Short mmCIF file of N, CA and C in Angstrom, two decimals:
data_model
loop_
_atom_site.label_atom_id
_atom_site.label_comp_id
_atom_site.label_asym_id
_atom_site.label_seq_id
_atom_site.Cartn_x
_atom_site.Cartn_y
_atom_site.Cartn_z
N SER A 1 -140.60 -66.01 88.05
CA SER A 1 -141.49 -65.06 87.38
C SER A 1 -142.13 -64.08 88.37
N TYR A 2 -142.53 -64.59 89.53
CA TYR A 2 -143.24 -63.80 90.53
C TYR A 2 -142.32 -62.81 91.23
N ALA A 3 -142.86 -61.64 91.57
CA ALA A 3 -142.13 -60.67 92.39
C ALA A 3 -142.13 -61.12 93.85
N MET A 4 -141.25 -60.52 94.65
CA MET A 4 -141.14 -60.88 96.07
C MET A 4 -142.30 -60.37 96.91
N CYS A 5 -142.71 -61.17 97.89
CA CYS A 5 -143.68 -60.72 98.89
C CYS A 5 -143.01 -59.67 99.79
N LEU A 6 -143.66 -58.54 100.00
CA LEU A 6 -143.05 -57.45 100.76
C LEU A 6 -143.63 -57.32 102.16
N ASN A 7 -144.66 -58.11 102.46
CA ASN A 7 -145.35 -57.97 103.73
C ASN A 7 -144.90 -59.00 104.78
N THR A 8 -145.79 -59.28 105.73
CA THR A 8 -145.45 -60.16 106.86
C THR A 8 -146.05 -61.57 106.75
N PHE A 9 -145.32 -62.52 107.31
CA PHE A 9 -145.77 -63.91 107.40
C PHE A 9 -146.07 -64.26 108.85
N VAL A 10 -146.98 -65.21 109.07
CA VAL A 10 -147.22 -65.76 110.41
C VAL A 10 -147.00 -67.28 110.41
N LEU A 11 -146.36 -67.79 111.46
CA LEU A 11 -146.10 -69.22 111.59
C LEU A 11 -147.36 -69.93 112.06
N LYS A 12 -147.76 -71.00 111.38
CA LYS A 12 -149.06 -71.63 111.69
C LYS A 12 -148.94 -72.83 112.61
N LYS A 13 -147.72 -73.34 112.77
CA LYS A 13 -147.53 -74.48 113.65
C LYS A 13 -146.08 -74.75 113.96
N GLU A 14 -145.88 -75.64 114.93
CA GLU A 14 -144.56 -76.00 115.39
C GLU A 14 -143.71 -76.44 114.21
N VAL A 15 -142.46 -75.99 114.22
CA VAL A 15 -141.49 -76.34 113.22
C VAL A 15 -140.98 -77.74 113.56
N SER A 16 -140.53 -78.49 112.55
CA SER A 16 -140.04 -79.84 112.82
C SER A 16 -138.98 -80.28 111.81
N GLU A 17 -138.21 -81.31 112.15
CA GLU A 17 -137.08 -81.71 111.32
C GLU A 17 -137.26 -83.13 110.80
N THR A 18 -136.96 -83.33 109.52
CA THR A 18 -137.06 -84.65 108.88
C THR A 18 -135.78 -85.47 109.02
N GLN A 19 -135.81 -86.66 108.44
CA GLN A 19 -134.67 -87.56 108.44
C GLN A 19 -133.46 -86.93 107.76
N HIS A 20 -133.71 -86.22 106.66
CA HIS A 20 -132.63 -85.60 105.89
C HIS A 20 -132.06 -84.34 106.55
N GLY A 21 -132.57 -83.99 107.73
CA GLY A 21 -132.15 -82.77 108.40
C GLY A 21 -132.75 -81.51 107.81
N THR A 22 -133.80 -81.64 107.02
CA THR A 22 -134.53 -80.46 106.57
C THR A 22 -135.64 -80.10 107.56
N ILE A 23 -136.04 -78.83 107.52
CA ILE A 23 -137.00 -78.31 108.46
C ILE A 23 -138.28 -78.02 107.71
N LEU A 24 -139.40 -78.31 108.36
CA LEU A 24 -140.71 -78.09 107.77
C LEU A 24 -141.34 -76.88 108.43
N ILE A 25 -141.75 -75.90 107.62
CA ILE A 25 -142.30 -74.65 108.10
C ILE A 25 -143.63 -74.36 107.39
N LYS A 26 -144.69 -74.13 108.15
CA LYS A 26 -145.99 -73.80 107.57
C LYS A 26 -146.32 -72.35 107.90
N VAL A 27 -146.51 -71.52 106.87
CA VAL A 27 -146.76 -70.10 107.09
C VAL A 27 -148.02 -69.61 106.41
N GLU A 28 -148.50 -68.46 106.88
CA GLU A 28 -149.63 -67.79 106.26
C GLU A 28 -149.17 -66.36 106.02
N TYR A 29 -149.65 -65.75 104.94
CA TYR A 29 -149.15 -64.43 104.54
C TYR A 29 -150.17 -63.34 104.87
N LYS A 30 -149.69 -62.16 105.23
CA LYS A 30 -150.59 -61.11 105.68
C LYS A 30 -150.63 -59.90 104.74
N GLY A 31 -150.03 -60.04 103.56
CA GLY A 31 -149.98 -58.95 102.60
C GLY A 31 -151.03 -59.06 101.52
N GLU A 32 -151.11 -58.03 100.67
CA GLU A 32 -152.13 -57.98 99.63
C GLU A 32 -151.51 -58.14 98.24
N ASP A 33 -150.20 -58.38 98.20
CA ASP A 33 -149.46 -58.43 96.94
C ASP A 33 -149.20 -59.84 96.41
N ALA A 34 -150.04 -60.79 96.81
CA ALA A 34 -149.96 -62.14 96.26
C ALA A 34 -150.66 -62.19 94.91
N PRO A 35 -150.25 -63.13 94.03
CA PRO A 35 -149.19 -64.11 94.27
C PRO A 35 -147.80 -63.47 94.28
N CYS A 36 -146.92 -64.02 95.11
CA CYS A 36 -145.57 -63.48 95.27
C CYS A 36 -144.63 -64.55 95.84
N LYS A 37 -143.33 -64.32 95.67
CA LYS A 37 -142.29 -65.26 96.10
C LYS A 37 -141.93 -65.04 97.56
N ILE A 38 -141.85 -66.12 98.32
CA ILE A 38 -141.51 -66.00 99.73
C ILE A 38 -140.01 -65.75 99.92
N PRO A 39 -139.66 -64.61 100.52
CA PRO A 39 -138.24 -64.32 100.79
C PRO A 39 -137.70 -65.22 101.89
N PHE A 40 -136.58 -65.90 101.61
CA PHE A 40 -136.00 -66.84 102.56
C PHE A 40 -134.50 -66.61 102.69
N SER A 41 -134.02 -66.53 103.92
CA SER A 41 -132.60 -66.36 104.18
C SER A 41 -132.24 -67.00 105.52
N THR A 42 -130.95 -67.13 105.80
CA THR A 42 -130.50 -67.68 107.08
C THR A 42 -129.45 -66.75 107.70
N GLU A 43 -129.43 -66.68 109.03
CA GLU A 43 -128.55 -65.77 109.76
C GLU A 43 -127.92 -66.43 110.99
N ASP A 44 -126.76 -65.93 111.39
CA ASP A 44 -126.15 -66.29 112.67
C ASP A 44 -126.81 -65.49 113.80
N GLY A 45 -126.24 -65.56 115.00
CA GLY A 45 -126.79 -64.85 116.15
C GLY A 45 -126.73 -63.33 116.04
N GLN A 46 -125.67 -62.82 115.43
CA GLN A 46 -125.48 -61.37 115.33
C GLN A 46 -126.01 -60.77 114.01
N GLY A 47 -126.71 -61.58 113.22
CA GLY A 47 -127.40 -61.08 112.04
C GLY A 47 -126.73 -61.20 110.67
N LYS A 48 -125.56 -61.82 110.57
CA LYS A 48 -124.91 -61.95 109.26
C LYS A 48 -125.25 -63.25 108.54
N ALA A 49 -125.25 -63.20 107.20
CA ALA A 49 -125.72 -64.30 106.35
C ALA A 49 -125.07 -65.66 106.63
N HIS A 50 -125.76 -66.71 106.17
CA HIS A 50 -125.40 -68.10 106.47
C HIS A 50 -125.65 -69.02 105.27
N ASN A 51 -125.55 -70.33 105.50
CA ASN A 51 -125.47 -71.34 104.45
C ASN A 51 -126.70 -72.24 104.29
N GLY A 52 -127.86 -71.66 103.99
CA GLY A 52 -129.09 -72.44 103.88
C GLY A 52 -129.75 -72.35 102.52
N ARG A 53 -130.59 -73.33 102.21
CA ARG A 53 -131.24 -73.37 100.90
C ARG A 53 -132.67 -73.87 100.99
N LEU A 54 -133.48 -73.49 100.02
CA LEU A 54 -134.84 -74.01 99.96
C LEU A 54 -134.85 -75.37 99.28
N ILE A 55 -135.77 -76.22 99.69
CA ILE A 55 -136.05 -77.46 98.98
C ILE A 55 -137.30 -77.25 98.12
N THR A 56 -138.38 -76.73 98.72
CA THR A 56 -139.54 -76.26 97.96
C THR A 56 -139.01 -75.47 96.77
N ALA A 57 -138.27 -74.41 97.09
CA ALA A 57 -137.35 -73.74 96.16
C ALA A 57 -137.93 -72.89 95.01
N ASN A 58 -139.25 -72.89 94.85
CA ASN A 58 -139.95 -71.71 94.34
C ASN A 58 -141.21 -71.59 95.17
N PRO A 59 -141.02 -71.38 96.48
CA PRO A 59 -142.12 -71.25 97.42
C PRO A 59 -142.79 -69.92 97.17
N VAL A 60 -144.11 -69.96 97.00
CA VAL A 60 -144.90 -68.79 96.64
C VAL A 60 -146.20 -68.77 97.42
N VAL A 61 -146.66 -67.57 97.74
CA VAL A 61 -148.00 -67.36 98.27
C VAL A 61 -148.94 -67.18 97.09
N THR A 62 -149.90 -68.09 96.95
CA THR A 62 -150.88 -67.98 95.87
C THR A 62 -152.13 -67.22 96.33
N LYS A 63 -152.61 -67.56 97.52
CA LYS A 63 -153.73 -66.85 98.12
C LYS A 63 -153.38 -66.46 99.55
N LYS A 64 -153.61 -65.20 99.90
CA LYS A 64 -153.32 -64.73 101.25
C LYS A 64 -153.91 -65.65 102.32
N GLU A 65 -155.11 -66.15 102.06
CA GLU A 65 -155.86 -66.91 103.05
C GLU A 65 -155.43 -68.38 103.14
N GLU A 66 -154.48 -68.78 102.30
CA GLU A 66 -154.10 -70.18 102.17
C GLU A 66 -152.63 -70.41 102.56
N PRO A 67 -152.41 -71.26 103.57
CA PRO A 67 -151.08 -71.51 104.14
C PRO A 67 -150.14 -72.11 103.11
N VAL A 68 -148.84 -71.93 103.32
CA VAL A 68 -147.83 -72.48 102.44
C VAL A 68 -146.89 -73.34 103.27
N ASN A 69 -146.62 -74.55 102.77
CA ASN A 69 -145.66 -75.44 103.42
C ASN A 69 -144.29 -75.30 102.79
N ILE A 70 -143.31 -74.90 103.59
CA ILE A 70 -141.95 -74.70 103.13
C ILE A 70 -141.08 -75.82 103.68
N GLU A 71 -140.13 -76.29 102.87
CA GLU A 71 -139.11 -77.20 103.36
C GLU A 71 -137.75 -76.58 103.06
N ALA A 72 -136.87 -76.57 104.06
CA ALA A 72 -135.62 -75.83 103.91
C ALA A 72 -134.51 -76.68 104.49
N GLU A 73 -133.29 -76.51 103.98
CA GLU A 73 -132.15 -77.21 104.54
C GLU A 73 -131.24 -76.19 105.20
N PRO A 74 -131.30 -76.10 106.55
CA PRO A 74 -130.55 -75.04 107.20
C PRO A 74 -129.11 -75.49 107.34
N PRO A 75 -128.22 -74.56 107.66
CA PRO A 75 -126.83 -74.98 107.90
C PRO A 75 -126.71 -75.85 109.15
N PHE A 76 -125.60 -76.57 109.24
CA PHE A 76 -125.30 -77.31 110.45
C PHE A 76 -125.10 -76.40 111.64
N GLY A 77 -125.49 -76.90 112.80
CA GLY A 77 -125.34 -76.15 114.04
C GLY A 77 -126.50 -75.19 114.20
N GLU A 78 -126.29 -74.11 114.93
CA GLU A 78 -127.37 -73.17 115.22
C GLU A 78 -127.51 -72.14 114.11
N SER A 79 -128.74 -71.91 113.67
CA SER A 79 -128.96 -70.84 112.71
C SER A 79 -130.32 -70.26 112.95
N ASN A 80 -130.56 -69.13 112.30
CA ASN A 80 -131.87 -68.52 112.28
C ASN A 80 -132.41 -68.46 110.86
N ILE A 81 -133.54 -69.13 110.65
CA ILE A 81 -134.20 -69.10 109.35
C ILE A 81 -135.13 -67.89 109.34
N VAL A 82 -134.99 -67.05 108.33
CA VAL A 82 -135.74 -65.80 108.23
C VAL A 82 -136.68 -65.88 107.04
N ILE A 83 -137.96 -65.68 107.29
CA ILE A 83 -138.97 -65.76 106.25
C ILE A 83 -139.63 -64.40 106.14
N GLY A 84 -139.48 -63.77 104.98
CA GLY A 84 -139.92 -62.39 104.83
C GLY A 84 -138.73 -61.47 105.01
N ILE A 85 -138.98 -60.17 104.97
CA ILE A 85 -137.89 -59.20 104.96
C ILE A 85 -137.93 -58.21 106.12
N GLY A 86 -136.75 -57.69 106.47
CA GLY A 86 -136.61 -56.60 107.42
C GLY A 86 -137.08 -56.90 108.83
N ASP A 87 -137.42 -55.84 109.55
CA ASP A 87 -138.16 -55.97 110.79
C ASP A 87 -139.43 -56.72 110.43
N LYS A 88 -140.07 -57.34 111.41
CA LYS A 88 -141.31 -58.07 111.17
C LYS A 88 -141.09 -59.45 110.53
N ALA A 89 -139.96 -59.65 109.85
CA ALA A 89 -139.69 -60.97 109.27
C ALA A 89 -139.80 -62.02 110.36
N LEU A 90 -140.36 -63.18 110.02
CA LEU A 90 -140.42 -64.31 110.95
C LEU A 90 -139.03 -64.91 111.06
N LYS A 91 -138.57 -65.12 112.29
CA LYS A 91 -137.25 -65.68 112.53
C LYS A 91 -137.39 -66.92 113.38
N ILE A 92 -136.84 -68.03 112.90
CA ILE A 92 -136.97 -69.32 113.57
C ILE A 92 -135.58 -69.84 113.89
N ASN A 93 -135.30 -70.03 115.17
CA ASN A 93 -133.98 -70.50 115.59
C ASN A 93 -133.98 -72.03 115.58
N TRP A 94 -132.94 -72.65 115.02
CA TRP A 94 -132.93 -74.11 114.92
C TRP A 94 -131.52 -74.64 115.03
N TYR A 95 -131.36 -75.85 115.56
CA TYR A 95 -130.03 -76.45 115.64
C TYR A 95 -130.03 -77.77 114.86
N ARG A 96 -129.20 -77.84 113.82
CA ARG A 96 -129.14 -79.02 112.96
C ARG A 96 -127.91 -79.85 113.28
N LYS A 97 -128.13 -81.07 113.74
CA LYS A 97 -127.02 -82.01 113.94
C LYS A 97 -126.90 -82.95 112.74
N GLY A 98 -125.68 -83.33 112.40
CA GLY A 98 -125.44 -84.41 111.44
C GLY A 98 -125.28 -85.75 112.14
N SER A 99 -124.86 -86.79 111.43
CA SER A 99 -124.78 -88.10 112.07
C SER A 99 -123.54 -88.28 112.95
N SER A 100 -123.72 -89.01 114.05
CA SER A 100 -122.63 -89.38 114.93
C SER A 100 -121.57 -90.17 114.15
#
């Protein structure tokens, strides 16, 4: 239902990985257009799309002043999780291993 957030996000703490190989990301939003949907995508090193998905999966900013906890399942190996759009988007590099 919500439109996309068009502004910038800030990372509030160290990123971390769960047992299921999902990543936990805590962000704060710097725009005035909340409530809005958090734009989420994944990229390779040279900037082309990749194979990641949200677990939260309707992650939204309700109040600008209030952090949002995102859980995401990035692709295997190295990827860049991108939160927000364009330049200024937060980009988090991560390497996901599967089981030996």
